C-alpha cells in the first residue's frame, strides 16, 4: 500500500532521512457526514496543490531534491555542513530555522524570476 | 490489514487534556444520536 513505511525517518539524521523522500511524498494525497469526508478531501487537495504551486514557482517542479542557486546567508545559521547533516535531525532543523523561512521563500521566488528573465534575453539573441 | 509504522528515537509532547479529537468525537456522537432519533414517532399525545 501507499502507507508503508510512512515517516519512519523522523528520528533519522537529515542526510539519512533525505534518502526516503518518496515514501512521505506519495502519502500526501491519499448527509452532514458526507460534507465531512468531502471537505477533508478538498482541504488535502488544496494544501497539496498550494505546495506544488510553490515548488513550481521556485522552479523545482517535478523534482524531489532540487537545489537552487541563491546564496545561504550566515545569519540564518552559522552551523557547518558536518554538524547539521550528520548531527541534527529534520525536526530540530525546522524548529531552528523558522523565523527566516519566509525571507528564503521570497529570495527563491525572485531568483527564479530573474533566472527566467536572463534565459529569455539570452534566447532572444 | 491495518498498518502501524513504528518511529524510533522520537520524543513527542502529548497532552490528553488539550486533545481536539475528544471534543470532535463528543460532537460526532451527539450528532449521530440526533440523526438516529429523527426517523421515529414523536410522543406529543402522551402529554395527558
Amino acid at each position, epitope marked *: 500500500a501507499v502507507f508503508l513505511g510512512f515517516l519512519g525517518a523522523a528520528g533519522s539524521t537529515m542526510g539519512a532521512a533525505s534518502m526516503t523522500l518518496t515514501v512521505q511524498a506519495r502519502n500526501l494525497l491519499s448527509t452532514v457526514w458526507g460534507i465531512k469526508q468531502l471537505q477533508a478531501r478538498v482541504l488535502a487537495v488544496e494544501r497539496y496543490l498550494r505546495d506544488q504551486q510553490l515548488l513550481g514557482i521556485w522552479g523545482c517542479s517535478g523534482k524531489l531534491i532540487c537545489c537552487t542557486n541563491v546564496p545561504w546567508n550566515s545569519s540564518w545559521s552559522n552551523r557547518n555542513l558536518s554538524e547539521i547533516w550528520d548531527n541534527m535531525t529534520w525536526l530540530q532543523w525546522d524548529k531552528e530555522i523558522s523565523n527566516y523561512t519566509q525571507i528564503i521563500y521570497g529570495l527563491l521566488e525572485e531568483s527564479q524570476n530573474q533566472q527566467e528573465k536572463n534565459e529569455q534575453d539570452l534566447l532572444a539573441l | 490489514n491495518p498498518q502501524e509504522i513504528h518511529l524510533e*528515537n522520537v520524543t513527542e509532547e502529548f497532552n490528553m487534556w488539550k486533545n481536539n479529537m475528544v471534543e470532535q468525537m463528543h460532537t460526532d456522537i451527539i450528532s449521530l444520536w440526533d440523526q438516529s432519533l429523527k426517523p421515529c414517532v414523536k410522543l406529543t399525545p402522551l402529554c395527558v
Partner: nanobody, 122 residues
Framework: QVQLQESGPGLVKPSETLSLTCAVYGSSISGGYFYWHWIRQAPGKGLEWIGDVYFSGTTGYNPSLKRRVRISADTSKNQFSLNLRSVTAADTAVYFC????????????????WGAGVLVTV
C-alpha cells in the same frame, strides 16, 4: 517491546534450498531506520556474517556467500527471508537474524537486538 522470531525447516536434506523466515514484532521493516542482518555461528566457531537487507531492496551479502544466498524482505507482512542454496555439510550453525541502526547515521553498524536463534542442522 521488540523481538524477532525465526521459523522454517530446522533439519533439511543437504544439497538443496534452505529457507529461514525471520519475523519481527516491534520495529517495522519498512522504516528506513534499520537494516536486517543474518548473522550465523557454527558450533565451535565464532560469529559469521551472511548478509543484510534494506527496506528499499539494497541488499548486500557476504563475499564468501555472494553466490549461494538470497535475502528478501516483504514489508506488507513485515518479515524477511533468507534462502541458502546448495548448503554443504559445513552449514550446521545457529542462524541469528539481527537488527542494525545503520540507517539514521547517528551511529555506525551496531547489532543491538538479536533473535532467539534457530538451530538449523544439515
Amino acid at each position: 517491546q521488540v523481538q524477532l522470531q525465526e521459523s522454517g525447516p530446522g533439519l533439511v536434506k543437504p544439497s538443496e534450498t534452505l529457507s529461514l523466515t525471520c519475523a519481527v514484532y516491534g520495529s517495522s521493516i519498512s522504516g528506513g531506520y534499520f537494516y536486517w542482518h543474518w548473522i550465523r555461528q557454527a558450533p565451535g566457531k565464532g560469529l559469521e556474517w551472511i548478509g543484510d537487507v534494506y527496506f528499499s531492496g539494497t541488499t548486500g551479502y557476504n563475499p564468501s556467500l555472494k553466490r549461494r544466498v538470497r535475502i528478501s524482505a516483504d514489508t506488507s507482512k513485515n518479515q524477511f527471508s533468507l534462502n541458502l542454496r546448495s548448503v554443504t555439510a559445513a552449514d550446521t550453525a545457529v542462524y541469528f537474524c539481527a537488527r542494525d541502526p545503520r540507517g539514521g547515521g547517528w551511529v555506525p553498524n551496531r547489532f543491538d537486538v538479536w533473535g532467539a536463534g534457530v538451530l538449523v542442522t544439515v
